[PDB]
């Protein structure tokens, strides 16, 4: 899981991607996705 303002995705990223309830995953760019 990931908490708010948490990088849930993004190239080079190697971690969980499920945003904590209440937030969703927003792909900022092809190398970063923050949960907001």
Curated annotation (Swiss-Prot):
Organism annotation: Hypocrea jecorina
Taxonomically, the superkingdom here is: Eukaryota
Tell me which residues make up the CBM1 domain: 1-36
Write out the function statement from the record.
Answer: Exocellobiohydrolases (CBH) that catalyzes the hydrolysis of 1,4-beta-D-glucosidic bonds in cellulose to release the disaccharide cellobiose. The degradation of cellulose involves an interplay between different cellulolytic enzymes. Hydrolysis starts with endoglucanases (EGs), which cut internal beta-1,4-glucosidic bonds in cellulose to reduce the polymerization degree of the substrate and create new chain ends for exocellobiohydrolases (CBHs). The CBHs release the disaccharide cellobiose from the non-reducing end of the cellulose polymer chain.
Annotated S-S bridges: 8-25, 19-35
Q: What else is known?
A: T.reesei produces two different exocellobiohydrolases. They are unique in that they can hydrolyze crystalline cellulose in the absence of endoglucanases.
The protein depicted here goes by the name Exoglucanase 1
Full-sequence range covered: 478 to 513 of 513
Glycosylation is annotated at 1, 3, 14
Q: Where in the cell is it found?
A: Secreted
Recorded family membership: Belongs to the glycosyl hydrolase 7 (cellulase C) family.
PTM annotation: N-glycosylated. The catalytic core domain comprises three N-linked glycans which each consist of a single N-acetylglucosamine residue. O-glycosylated. Within the linker domain, all 8 threonines are variably glycosylated with between at least one, and up to three, mannose residues per site. All serines in this domain are at least partially glycosylated with a single mannose residue. O-glycosylation of the cellulase linker provides protection from proteolysis. Linker glycans also contribute to binding affinity of cellobiohydrolases to cellulose.
Know anything about its domains from the record?
A: The enzyme consists of two functional domains, a catalytic core joined to a carbohydrate-binding domain (CBM) by a serine-, threonine-, and proline-rich, highly glycosylated linker sequence.
